[PDB]
Amino acid sequence: TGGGNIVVATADGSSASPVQFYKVCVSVVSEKCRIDTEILPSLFMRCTTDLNRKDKFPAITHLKFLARDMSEQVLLCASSIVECWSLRKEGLPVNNIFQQQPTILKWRILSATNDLDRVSAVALTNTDLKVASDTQFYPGLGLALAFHDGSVHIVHRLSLQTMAVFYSKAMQLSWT
Amino acid sequence: SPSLTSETEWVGYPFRLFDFTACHQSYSEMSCSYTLALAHAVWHHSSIGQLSLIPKFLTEVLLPIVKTEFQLLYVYHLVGPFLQRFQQERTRCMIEIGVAFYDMLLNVDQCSTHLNYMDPICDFLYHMKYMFTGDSVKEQVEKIICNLKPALKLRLRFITH
Amino acid sequence: LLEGTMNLTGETQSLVEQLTMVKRMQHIPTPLFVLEIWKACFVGLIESPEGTEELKWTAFTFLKIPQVLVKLKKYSHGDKDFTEDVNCAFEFLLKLTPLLDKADQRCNCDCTNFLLQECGKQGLLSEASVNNLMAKRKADREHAILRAEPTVTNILKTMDADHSKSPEGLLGVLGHMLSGKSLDLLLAAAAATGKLKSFARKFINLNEFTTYGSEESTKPASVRALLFDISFLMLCHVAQTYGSEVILSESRTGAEVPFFETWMQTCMPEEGKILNPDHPCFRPDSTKVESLVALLNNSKLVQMKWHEACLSISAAILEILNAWENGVLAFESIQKITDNIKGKVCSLAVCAVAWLVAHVRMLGLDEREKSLQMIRQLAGPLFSENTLQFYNERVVIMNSILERMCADVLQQTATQIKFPSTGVDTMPYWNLLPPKRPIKEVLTDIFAKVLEKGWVDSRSIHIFDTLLHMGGVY
């Protein structure tokens, strides 16, 4: 993650919505450990709010080395709906209580849609963010995903449109 | 000696009843099992000279009170798993316990429609012979084994050797 | 014993499948079979239960009776149709005295209660000549203050199922006030599955129907409002007792829409905490703050109207935002809570628990909802205001037990509550999993013992259920 610590959270999938984030520290004293259990703000994939259906039940939920800018929850029934969340911190609008540490964390949705895919490969040895890499077409933060039916439609996040597929179990990304 | 004439009970199965560790549940802990357990305990704890009273005891009391077989298996569980103590110290009495065994056998043989559990008492007697009495009582025990039932006699025939 | 421990209620028609399974999927000689089944019935209610389960236990034991009745009806045919096989079976079983002594020592009256249930079964099953069997039983126990609960429960079960047989309204609240005085033994008897589903349906329909309209008689309207509140509290307690069964009996069929919001997101073996901000937050701008301010500064009680319960989420939002999130009010939030802690208001506790769960789903660094829950569990509503309930005593007990059953994560990860239950024994079934120990103990703690034991160790059954639905079948 950002700081020199470890965090982790997921329980069952889209069925429920628990994520037991554990901010842990192990370096305490020689020949001993004191792993903490700090409860970071929990969240989930809002995709289940659809009155149509709720059967998503992800089975991968992969992460990356940048613990702020992804959430690999995805509809994984027999289903397909990729999702992506963030950690955009913001204060709450404390008002309407009268005439006129506020810092809190509430996750934000980034991108999600209905698709047709089962197995993911990898999120991103990627580049850094906060750079307008428009003219850049190398796999900077490139994201891939496998299609069940033959060819693979690997396309980076926030666009999801299409890339070169060159028309004629589990996989992973070999490299950049 | 509850009834002993019409029917003791259909649950009178000696093995399951006389078994311990059934007390682990709130059932299958009939009084007789507790009595057997306490007797085993006091006899395993007073095994120095207190066994001298069991031969006269079994002779006067326990002989003419047994017609069925579960009483026999009961008294067997009582005095049976102690023959090692007699073989160690009280060799003077082990012959008496043996002839008592054989007396119980002849008694249950004489008054019975048919025996259903030959094998248990058979290999019990076999163990007793091969482990405790060896080959001493043969000539004496013959005078008891001769006048038993034909089926029981042919079944226990191999005691002669 | 497993079936009698998991699904005692919610019995639409499980007994049929149970009978067909125990008959076909086994090799059980009829005498030994009935001996074993009656042993299984009798061994219960001794080791595991010490509270509410005991009543449920004896209810299941006496519900095993119609099971063997349907058996005798349809198991055998023209070949010793339960004439004397069960007779000699019970005769042989009577030799199992220590079970009877254990039952007697447990109930302190189980001999008379046993005689009573025996002659009652005889009143329903065959009673040709088993009076001699009853006499032999009485002879089998020769050497060896106010009211025994099993007798009175099985007696009044009929009169409770047939309470008034008047599906109407405009009656007195005494009908439910009498039940509010007694324990949940009423629901335990109702668990006989003969009226349980039907009673739940009728009760839900009466609740959805008795919306008390809009009148001007303050006394009668307040009395009916308090009656409705107590009825909803009793319904929520019966739900928390079983869970899925109440929702199934209430949401099986019918073209309608009762108050499913407080029945599907209140409390269950499922978090649904992070979902609480999303789905149950239907707060239209129409009177969004009007009802909020009304419930905040009511102390507004012109006509009986309780619908903001499904909309108190916005009120809770404003409360948590103004109490310490902004510091606009130091102790006025406590005053508003005490106002909301007034009598005939129990749905507020549901919203409080839901938002405490939602804040547990947060960073948990503020723990303002923890203090809110602590205040809610405090002695605040000690009949200070003019609580026109007259039944808050039992209502407070229902509220306390409902608060206790949920928010367990808060009850553990934070400071202990001030014991608002004042009961006898809380729910014994819990996690019971040693935290700082690996999973390599299920065989060394359960499988090893039960092998030498003679039963399924009903206590560890729940533990095995948690382990199973926690790990993987493989």
Short mmCIF file of C-alpha atoms in Angstrom, two decimals, chain C:
data_model
loop_
_atom_site.label_atom_id
_atom_site.label_comp_id
_atom_site.label_asym_id
_atom_site.label_seq_id
_atom_site.Cartn_x
_atom_site.Cartn_y
_atom_site.Cartn_z
CA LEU C 1 -31.27 -34.46 17.74
CA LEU C 2 -29.66 -32.50 14.89
CA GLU C 3 -33.05 -31.84 13.30
CA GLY C 4 -34.49 -30.85 16.67
CA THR C 5 -31.63 -28.41 17.18
CA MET C 6 -31.63 -26.60 13.81
CA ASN C 7 -35.19 -26.37 12.47
CA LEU C 8 -37.76 -26.66 15.23
CA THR C 9 -39.92 -23.87 13.81
CA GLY C 10 -40.58 -23.05 10.16
CA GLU C 11 -42.22 -26.47 9.88
CA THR C 12 -44.54 -26.14 6.86
CA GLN C 13 -44.22 -29.82 5.93
CA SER C 14 -40.75 -31.11 6.92
CA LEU C 15 -42.10 -34.03 8.96
CA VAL C 16 -43.23 -35.87 5.82
CA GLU C 17 -39.78 -35.79 4.23
CA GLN C 18 -38.25 -36.63 7.62
CA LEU C 19 -40.50 -39.68 7.98
CA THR C 20 -39.86 -40.92 4.44
CA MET C 21 -36.11 -40.43 4.87
CA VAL C 22 -35.84 -42.19 8.24
CA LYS C 23 -37.98 -45.01 6.86
CA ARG C 24 -36.51 -45.65 3.41
CA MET C 25 -32.92 -44.45 3.88
CA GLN C 26 -32.09 -46.83 6.76
CA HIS C 27 -32.05 -50.46 7.97
CA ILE C 28 -33.92 -50.25 11.28
CA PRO C 29 -35.83 -53.19 12.80
CA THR C 30 -39.16 -51.79 14.06
CA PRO C 31 -38.62 -52.63 17.79
CA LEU C 32 -35.06 -51.31 17.84
CA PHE C 33 -36.19 -48.45 15.59
CA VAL C 34 -38.90 -47.21 17.95
CA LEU C 35 -36.61 -47.79 20.95
CA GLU C 36 -33.93 -45.62 19.34
CA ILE C 37 -36.39 -42.91 18.27
CA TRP C 38 -37.87 -42.63 21.76
CA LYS C 39 -34.39 -42.62 23.29
CA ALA C 40 -33.51 -39.76 20.94
CA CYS C 41 -36.62 -37.87 22.04
CA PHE C 42 -35.91 -38.48 25.73
CA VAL C 43 -32.19 -37.68 25.86
CA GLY C 44 -32.78 -34.07 24.83
CA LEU C 45 -33.46 -31.01 27.03
CA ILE C 46 -30.82 -32.20 29.51
CA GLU C 47 -27.25 -31.41 28.46
CA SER C 48 -27.43 -28.43 26.09
CA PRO C 49 -30.26 -26.06 27.08
CA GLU C 50 -30.59 -23.91 30.19
CA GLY C 51 -33.07 -21.27 29.00
CA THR C 52 -35.47 -20.61 26.12
CA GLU C 53 -34.19 -23.66 24.25
CA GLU C 54 -35.51 -25.98 26.97
CA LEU C 55 -39.09 -25.01 26.12
CA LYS C 56 -38.24 -25.41 22.44
CA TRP C 57 -36.66 -28.77 23.31
CA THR C 58 -39.74 -30.16 25.06
CA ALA C 59 -41.90 -28.70 22.29
CA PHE C 60 -39.88 -30.67 19.73
CA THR C 61 -40.10 -33.81 21.87
CA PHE C 62 -43.89 -33.54 22.05
CA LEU C 63 -44.04 -32.68 18.34
CA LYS C 64 -42.25 -35.95 17.63
CA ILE C 65 -45.55 -37.52 18.76
CA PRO C 66 -47.62 -36.60 15.66
CA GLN C 67 -44.62 -37.84 13.65
CA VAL C 68 -44.92 -41.36 15.07
CA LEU C 69 -48.69 -40.98 14.78
CA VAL C 70 -48.45 -40.44 11.01
CA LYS C 71 -45.96 -43.31 11.06
CA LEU C 72 -48.42 -45.74 12.67
CA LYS C 73 -51.00 -44.41 10.21
CA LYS C 74 -48.94 -45.04 7.07
CA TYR C 75 -45.80 -47.13 7.95
CA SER C 76 -47.20 -50.64 8.44
CA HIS C 77 -50.34 -52.20 6.98
CA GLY C 78 -52.08 -55.43 7.98
CA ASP C 79 -48.89 -56.74 9.66
CA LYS C 80 -48.88 -55.95 13.39
CA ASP C 81 -50.19 -52.41 12.93
CA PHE C 82 -48.60 -50.93 16.07
CA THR C 83 -50.73 -53.22 18.26
CA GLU C 84 -48.17 -54.43 20.81
CA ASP C 85 -44.72 -53.71 19.29
CA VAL C 86 -44.68 -50.18 20.71
CA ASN C 87 -46.12 -51.63 23.92
CA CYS C 88 -43.25 -54.06 24.51
CA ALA C 89 -40.84 -51.37 23.26
CA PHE C 90 -41.94 -48.92 25.95
CA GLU C 91 -41.93 -51.79 28.46
CA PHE C 92 -38.27 -52.53 27.69
CA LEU C 93 -37.52 -48.79 27.69
CA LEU C 94 -38.97 -48.53 31.20
CA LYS C 95 -35.95 -50.55 32.37
CA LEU C 96 -33.88 -47.46 31.50
CA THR C 97 -34.47 -45.90 34.93
CA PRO C 98 -31.42 -43.56 35.00
CA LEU C 99 -32.86 -41.53 32.12
CA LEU C 100 -36.05 -41.06 34.15
CA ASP C 101 -34.06 -40.10 37.25
CA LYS C 102 -32.06 -37.59 35.20
CA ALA C 103 -35.23 -36.06 33.75
CA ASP C 104 -36.77 -35.88 37.24
CA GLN C 105 -33.67 -34.23 38.72
CA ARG C 106 -33.73 -31.77 35.81
CA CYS C 107 -37.37 -30.68 35.89
CA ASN C 108 -37.97 -31.46 39.62
CA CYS C 109 -41.42 -32.64 38.49
CA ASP C 110 -40.64 -34.73 35.39
CA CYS C 111 -42.28 -37.81 36.90
CA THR C 112 -45.77 -36.27 37.01
CA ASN C 113 -45.15 -34.47 33.71
CA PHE C 114 -43.99 -37.76 32.17
CA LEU C 115 -47.12 -39.55 33.40
CA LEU C 116 -49.22 -36.69 32.00
CA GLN C 117 -47.57 -36.71 28.58
CA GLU C 118 -47.87 -40.51 28.50
CA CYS C 119 -51.61 -40.48 29.13
CA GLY C 120 -51.93 -37.57 26.68
CA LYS C 121 -50.18 -39.58 23.96
CA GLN C 122 -52.52 -42.43 24.90
CA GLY C 123 -55.39 -39.99 24.38
CA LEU C 124 -54.11 -39.38 20.84
CA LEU C 125 -52.38 -42.67 20.01
CA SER C 126 -53.66 -46.17 20.75
CA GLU C 127 -54.87 -46.70 24.32
CA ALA C 128 -56.38 -50.20 24.13
CA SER C 129 -54.67 -51.78 27.15
CA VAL C 130 -51.61 -49.58 27.82
CA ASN C 131 -53.19 -48.45 31.09
CA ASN C 132 -51.46 -51.54 32.44
CA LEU C 133 -48.23 -50.18 30.95
CA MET C 134 -48.83 -46.84 32.69
CA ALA C 135 -49.40 -48.71 35.94
CA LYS C 136 -46.21 -50.73 35.50
CA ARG C 137 -44.36 -47.46 34.88
CA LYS C 138 -45.79 -45.97 38.08
CA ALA C 139 -44.67 -49.11 39.90
CA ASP C 140 -41.25 -48.76 38.23
CA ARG C 141 -40.51 -45.59 40.24
CA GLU C 142 -41.66 -46.69 43.69
CA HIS C 143 -38.38 -46.45 45.70
CA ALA C 144 -36.91 -43.52 43.74
CA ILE C 145 -44.31 -24.61 44.16
CA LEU C 146 -46.65 -22.51 41.99
CA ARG C 147 -46.95 -24.35 38.66
CA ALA C 148 -44.82 -26.71 36.57
CA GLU C 149 -44.13 -25.09 33.20
CA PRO C 150 -44.43 -28.13 30.84
CA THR C 151 -47.94 -29.07 32.01
CA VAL C 152 -49.31 -25.52 31.87
CA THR C 153 -47.66 -24.92 28.49
CA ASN C 154 -49.03 -28.03 26.79
CA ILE C 155 -52.40 -27.31 28.41
CA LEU C 156 -52.70 -23.67 27.34
CA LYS C 157 -51.30 -24.36 23.86
CA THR C 158 -54.80 -25.30 22.68
CA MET C 159 -56.44 -22.25 24.25
CA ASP C 160 -53.74 -20.05 22.71
CA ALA C 161 -54.20 -21.53 19.23
CA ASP C 162 -57.95 -20.95 19.75
CA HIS C 163 -57.60 -17.67 21.69
CA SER C 164 -60.68 -15.87 20.36
CA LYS C 165 -61.16 -17.21 16.82
CA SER C 166 -62.36 -13.69 15.98
CA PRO C 167 -60.57 -12.28 12.92
CA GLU C 168 -61.66 -8.68 13.51
CA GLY C 169 -60.67 -5.41 15.17
CA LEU C 170 -61.84 -2.62 17.49
CA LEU C 171 -61.20 -4.95 20.44
CA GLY C 172 -59.19 -4.38 23.60
CA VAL C 173 -55.41 -4.47 23.87
CA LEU C 174 -55.81 -6.80 26.86
CA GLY C 175 -55.46 -9.79 24.51
CA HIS C 176 -51.85 -8.87 23.79
CA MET C 177 -51.19 -7.33 27.22
CA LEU C 178 -51.81 -10.73 28.81
CA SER C 179 -49.26 -12.31 26.47
CA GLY C 180 -46.79 -9.50 27.15
CA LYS C 181 -46.89 -10.39 30.84
CA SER C 182 -46.02 -14.04 30.20
CA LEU C 183 -42.74 -15.26 28.70
CA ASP C 184 -42.12 -16.46 25.14
CA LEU C 185 -43.68 -19.77 26.20
CA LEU C 186 -46.69 -18.67 24.14
CA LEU C 187 -44.55 -18.58 20.99
CA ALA C 188 -42.91 -21.85 22.06
CA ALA C 189 -46.32 -23.53 22.15
CA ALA C 190 -47.26 -21.80 18.88
CA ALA C 191 -44.14 -23.42 17.39
CA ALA C 192 -46.25 -26.60 17.16
CA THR C 193 -46.49 -25.73 13.43
CA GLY C 194 -50.25 -26.23 13.58
CA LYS C 195 -51.00 -22.50 13.74
CA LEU C 196 -47.48 -20.96 13.67
CA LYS C 197 -47.53 -19.97 9.99
CA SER C 198 -51.24 -19.15 10.11
CA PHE C 199 -50.86 -17.18 13.34
CA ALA C 200 -47.94 -15.22 11.90
CA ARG C 201 -49.91 -14.49 8.73
CA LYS C 202 -52.99 -13.34 10.67
CA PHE C 203 -50.83 -11.19 12.95
CA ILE C 204 -49.00 -9.54 10.04
CA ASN C 205 -52.33 -8.93 8.31
CA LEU C 206 -53.84 -7.38 11.45
CA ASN C 207 -50.78 -5.14 11.82
CA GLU C 208 -50.89 -4.04 8.17
CA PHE C 209 -54.65 -3.46 8.57
CA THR C 210 -54.79 -1.79 11.99
CA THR C 211 -53.05 1.42 10.90
CA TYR C 212 -55.44 3.16 13.35
CA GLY C 213 -56.29 5.65 10.59
CA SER C 214 -56.33 9.23 11.88
CA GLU C 215 -58.53 10.05 14.87
CA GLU C 216 -58.78 12.71 17.55
CA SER C 217 -59.28 10.69 20.76
CA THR C 218 -55.84 11.16 22.34
CA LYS C 219 -56.32 8.50 25.03
CA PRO C 220 -57.64 5.71 22.80
CA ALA C 221 -55.28 6.60 19.94
CA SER C 222 -52.26 6.52 22.27
CA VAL C 223 -53.45 3.22 23.77
CA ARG C 224 -53.77 1.67 20.31
CA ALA C 225 -50.38 3.09 19.28
CA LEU C 226 -48.74 1.55 22.34
CA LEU C 227 -50.53 -1.74 21.62
CA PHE C 228 -49.23 -1.70 18.04
CA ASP C 229 -45.72 -0.92 19.29
CA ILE C 230 -45.81 -3.81 21.76
CA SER C 231 -47.15 -6.10 19.03
CA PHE C 232 -44.33 -5.10 16.68
CA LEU C 233 -41.79 -5.64 19.47
CA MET C 234 -43.19 -9.13 20.09
CA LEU C 235 -43.07 -9.86 16.35
CA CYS C 236 -39.45 -8.71 16.16
CA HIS C 237 -38.57 -10.86 19.17
CA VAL C 238 -40.24 -13.92 17.63
CA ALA C 239 -38.29 -13.17 14.45
CA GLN C 240 -34.96 -12.84 16.26
CA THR C 241 -35.79 -16.16 17.95
CA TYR C 242 -35.91 -18.05 14.64
CA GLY C 243 -35.20 -15.62 11.79
CA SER C 244 -35.77 -17.24 8.39
CA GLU C 245 -38.93 -18.98 9.63
CA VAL C 246 -40.79 -15.75 10.48
CA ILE C 247 -39.85 -14.09 7.18
CA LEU C 248 -40.91 -17.23 5.31
CA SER C 249 -44.25 -17.35 7.13
CA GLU C 250 -44.65 -13.63 6.36
CA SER C 251 -43.22 -13.47 2.83
CA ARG C 252 -44.28 -16.72 1.13
CA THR C 253 -47.26 -15.73 -1.03
CA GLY C 254 -49.80 -12.97 -1.51
CA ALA C 255 -50.21 -9.93 -3.77
CA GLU C 256 -49.36 -7.21 -1.26
CA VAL C 257 -46.47 -5.30 0.35
CA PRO C 258 -46.28 -5.32 4.18
CA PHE C 259 -43.50 -3.64 6.17
CA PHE C 260 -40.75 -5.83 4.70
CA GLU C 261 -38.11 -3.12 5.31
CA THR C 262 -37.91 -3.60 9.08
CA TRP C 263 -38.29 -7.35 8.51
CA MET C 264 -35.55 -7.94 5.92
CA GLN C 265 -32.81 -5.54 7.10
CA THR C 266 -33.18 -5.58 10.89
CA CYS C 267 -31.26 -8.60 12.21
CA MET C 268 -30.26 -11.96 10.72
CA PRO C 269 -27.19 -14.22 10.24
CA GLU C 270 -26.07 -11.77 7.55
CA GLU C 271 -24.28 -8.43 7.85
CA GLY C 272 -26.01 -6.31 5.20
CA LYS C 273 -24.37 -3.34 6.92
CA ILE C 274 -22.71 -1.60 3.96
CA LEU C 275 -25.94 -2.24 2.06
CA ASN C 276 -27.87 -0.21 4.64
CA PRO C 277 -26.65 3.16 3.26
CA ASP C 278 -27.61 2.12 -0.28
CA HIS C 279 -30.97 0.34 -0.42
CA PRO C 280 -32.92 1.20 2.79
CA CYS C 281 -32.05 4.89 2.28
CA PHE C 282 -35.15 5.68 0.21
CA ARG C 283 -35.68 9.23 1.54
CA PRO C 284 -37.74 11.35 -0.89
CA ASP C 285 -37.53 15.13 -0.46
CA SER C 286 -41.25 15.11 0.37
CA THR C 287 -41.39 15.67 4.15
CA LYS C 288 -37.80 14.41 4.44
CA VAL C 289 -36.97 16.90 7.21
CA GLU C 290 -40.55 17.50 8.41
CA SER C 291 -41.00 14.07 10.00
CA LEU C 292 -37.36 14.24 11.14
CA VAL C 293 -37.89 17.47 13.09
CA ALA C 294 -41.21 16.08 14.35
CA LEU C 295 -39.59 12.95 15.79
CA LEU C 296 -36.72 15.08 17.11
CA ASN C 297 -38.80 17.64 19.02
CA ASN C 298 -42.10 15.83 19.53
CA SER C 299 -41.96 15.44 23.33
CA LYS C 300 -46.63 16.54 17.42
CA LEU C 301 -48.66 13.69 18.92
CA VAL C 302 -52.06 14.97 17.75
CA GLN C 303 -52.92 11.87 15.71
CA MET C 304 -51.40 8.39 15.86
CA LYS C 305 -49.04 8.02 12.90
CA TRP C 306 -45.93 5.81 12.84
CA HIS C 307 -44.50 5.68 9.32
CA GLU C 308 -41.28 7.63 9.88
CA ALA C 309 -39.89 4.33 11.22
CA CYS C 310 -39.03 3.39 7.64
CA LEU C 311 -37.74 6.95 7.17
CA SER C 312 -35.89 7.56 10.47
CA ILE C 313 -32.67 6.91 8.55
CA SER C 314 -32.48 10.59 7.57
CA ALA C 315 -33.16 11.58 11.18
CA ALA C 316 -30.28 9.35 12.30
CA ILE C 317 -28.10 10.91 9.59
CA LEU C 318 -28.86 14.41 10.88
CA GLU C 319 -28.31 13.27 14.47
CA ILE C 320 -24.90 11.72 13.78
CA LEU C 321 -23.89 14.73 11.67
CA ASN C 322 -24.89 17.27 14.34
CA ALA C 323 -23.89 15.46 17.55
CA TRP C 324 -20.10 15.36 17.14
CA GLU C 325 -19.38 15.30 13.38
CA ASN C 326 -19.92 19.08 13.44
CA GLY C 327 -20.17 19.90 17.15
CA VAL C 328 -23.21 22.12 16.59
CA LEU C 329 -24.85 20.58 19.68
CA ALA C 330 -22.96 19.19 22.67
CA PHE C 331 -25.76 17.53 24.66
CA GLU C 332 -28.85 18.43 22.62
CA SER C 333 -28.27 15.16 20.75
CA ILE C 334 -28.68 13.32 24.06
CA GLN C 335 -31.95 15.20 24.63
CA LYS C 336 -33.18 14.24 21.16
CA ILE C 337 -32.20 10.62 21.84
CA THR C 338 -34.06 10.62 25.16
CA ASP C 339 -37.06 12.03 23.29
CA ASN C 340 -36.71 9.20 20.78
CA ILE C 341 -36.16 6.76 23.68
CA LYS C 342 -39.73 7.47 24.79
CA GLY C 343 -42.26 4.68 25.15
CA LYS C 344 -44.08 3.03 22.24
CA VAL C 345 -40.96 3.58 20.08
CA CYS C 346 -38.90 0.47 19.33
CA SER C 347 -38.20 0.89 15.62
CA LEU C 348 -35.69 3.61 16.54
CA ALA C 349 -33.52 0.88 18.07
CA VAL C 350 -33.53 -0.90 14.69
CA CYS C 351 -32.21 2.21 12.94
CA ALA C 352 -29.67 2.71 15.73
CA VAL C 353 -28.36 -0.85 15.34
CA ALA C 354 -28.27 -0.56 11.55
CA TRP C 355 -26.28 2.68 11.70
CA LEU C 356 -23.96 1.29 14.37
CA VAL C 357 -23.26 -1.56 11.94
CA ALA C 358 -22.74 0.97 9.14
CA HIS C 359 -20.26 2.88 11.31
CA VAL C 360 -18.50 -0.39 12.09
CA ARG C 361 -18.21 -0.58 8.30
CA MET C 362 -16.41 2.78 8.61
CA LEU C 363 -12.96 3.58 9.99
CA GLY C 364 -14.29 3.11 13.54
CA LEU C 365 -12.09 5.98 14.71
CA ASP C 366 -14.95 8.17 16.00
CA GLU C 367 -17.13 5.56 17.77
CA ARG C 368 -19.86 8.16 18.25
CA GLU C 369 -22.46 5.51 17.42
CA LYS C 370 -20.87 3.43 20.18
CA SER C 371 -21.72 6.17 22.69
CA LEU C 372 -25.18 6.45 21.12
CA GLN C 373 -25.79 2.72 21.60
CA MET C 374 -24.44 2.97 25.15
CA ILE C 375 -26.90 5.77 25.91
CA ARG C 376 -29.67 3.68 24.33
CA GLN C 377 -28.77 0.78 26.61
CA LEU C 378 -28.55 3.10 29.63
CA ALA C 379 -31.31 3.73 32.19
CA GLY C 380 -32.42 6.91 30.40
CA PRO C 381 -36.05 5.96 29.76
CA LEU C 382 -36.67 5.07 33.42
CA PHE C 383 -40.33 6.14 33.27
CA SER C 384 -39.16 9.76 33.51
CA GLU C 385 -41.57 11.21 30.96
CA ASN C 386 -45.29 10.43 30.78
CA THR C 387 -44.82 7.12 28.94
CA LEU C 388 -48.39 6.11 28.11
CA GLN C 389 -47.47 2.44 27.59
CA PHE C 390 -48.24 0.61 30.87
CA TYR C 391 -46.24 -2.30 29.43
CA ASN C 392 -42.76 -0.76 29.05
CA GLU C 393 -41.43 -3.34 31.54
CA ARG C 394 -41.81 -6.19 29.05
CA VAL C 395 -41.21 -3.79 26.16
CA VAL C 396 -37.86 -2.85 27.71
CA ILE C 397 -37.01 -6.55 27.97
CA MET C 398 -37.80 -7.11 24.29
CA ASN C 399 -35.78 -4.03 23.30
CA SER C 400 -32.82 -5.16 25.41
CA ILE C 401 -32.80 -8.71 24.03
CA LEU C 402 -33.13 -7.38 20.47
CA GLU C 403 -30.22 -4.99 21.04
CA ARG C 404 -28.23 -7.86 22.55
CA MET C 405 -28.77 -10.42 19.79
CA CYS C 406 -27.38 -8.10 17.12
CA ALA C 407 -24.38 -5.75 17.18
CA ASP C 408 -22.28 -8.60 18.62
CA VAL C 409 -19.24 -7.22 16.79
CA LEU C 410 -19.80 -3.94 18.64
CA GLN C 411 -20.52 -5.77 21.90
CA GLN C 412 -17.16 -7.52 21.59
CA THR C 413 -14.76 -5.07 19.91
CA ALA C 414 -15.84 -2.24 22.26
CA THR C 415 -16.53 -1.84 25.97
CA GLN C 416 -19.12 -4.09 27.57
CA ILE C 417 -22.71 -2.88 27.93
CA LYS C 418 -24.18 -1.99 31.34
CA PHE C 419 -26.15 -5.28 31.31
CA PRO C 420 -29.61 -4.06 30.21
CA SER C 421 -30.85 -7.64 29.86
CA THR C 422 -31.35 -8.56 33.55
CA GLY C 423 -32.26 -12.07 32.46
CA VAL C 424 -31.07 -15.54 33.46
CA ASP C 425 -28.84 -16.82 30.65
CA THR C 426 -28.06 -15.26 27.27
CA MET C 427 -27.81 -17.23 24.03
CA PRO C 428 -25.36 -20.11 24.60
CA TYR C 429 -24.89 -20.73 20.89
CA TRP C 430 -22.07 -18.49 19.69
CA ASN C 431 -18.70 -18.50 17.90
CA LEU C 432 -16.96 -20.61 20.58
CA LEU C 433 -13.90 -20.72 18.31
CA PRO C 434 -10.53 -20.16 20.03
CA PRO C 435 -9.08 -17.16 18.16
CA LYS C 436 -5.35 -17.78 18.68
CA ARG C 437 -5.51 -21.41 17.58
CA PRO C 438 -5.47 -23.05 14.13
CA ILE C 439 -8.25 -25.01 12.44
CA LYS C 440 -6.45 -28.28 13.19
CA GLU C 441 -8.64 -28.90 16.24
CA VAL C 442 -12.03 -29.91 14.79
CA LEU C 443 -11.00 -33.57 14.95
CA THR C 444 -9.12 -33.27 18.25
CA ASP C 445 -11.96 -31.41 20.03
CA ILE C 446 -15.13 -32.78 18.38
CA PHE C 447 -14.47 -35.88 16.25
CA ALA C 448 -12.31 -37.53 18.91
CA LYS C 449 -14.88 -37.06 21.67
CA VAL C 450 -18.00 -37.93 19.66
CA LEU C 451 -16.34 -41.16 18.54
CA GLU C 452 -16.14 -42.33 22.15
CA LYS C 453 -19.48 -40.62 22.83
CA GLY C 454 -22.90 -41.94 21.87
CA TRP C 455 -24.50 -38.94 20.18
CA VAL C 456 -23.85 -35.94 17.92
CA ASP C 457 -22.91 -33.62 20.81
CA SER C 458 -25.68 -31.11 20.06
CA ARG C 459 -23.57 -28.35 21.61
CA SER C 460 -20.80 -28.77 19.01
CA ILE C 461 -23.41 -29.05 16.23
CA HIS C 462 -23.59 -25.27 15.93
CA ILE C 463 -19.78 -25.13 15.97
CA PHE C 464 -19.63 -27.61 13.10
CA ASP C 465 -22.26 -25.59 11.24
CA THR C 466 -20.12 -22.46 11.57
CA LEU C 467 -17.00 -24.36 10.49
CA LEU C 468 -18.80 -25.80 7.46
CA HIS C 469 -20.40 -22.56 6.25
CA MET C 470 -17.09 -20.85 7.06
CA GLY C 471 -14.53 -23.04 5.30
CA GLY C 472 -14.76 -25.42 2.36
CA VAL C 473 -16.50 -28.78 1.95
CA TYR C 474 -13.43 -30.20 0.20
#
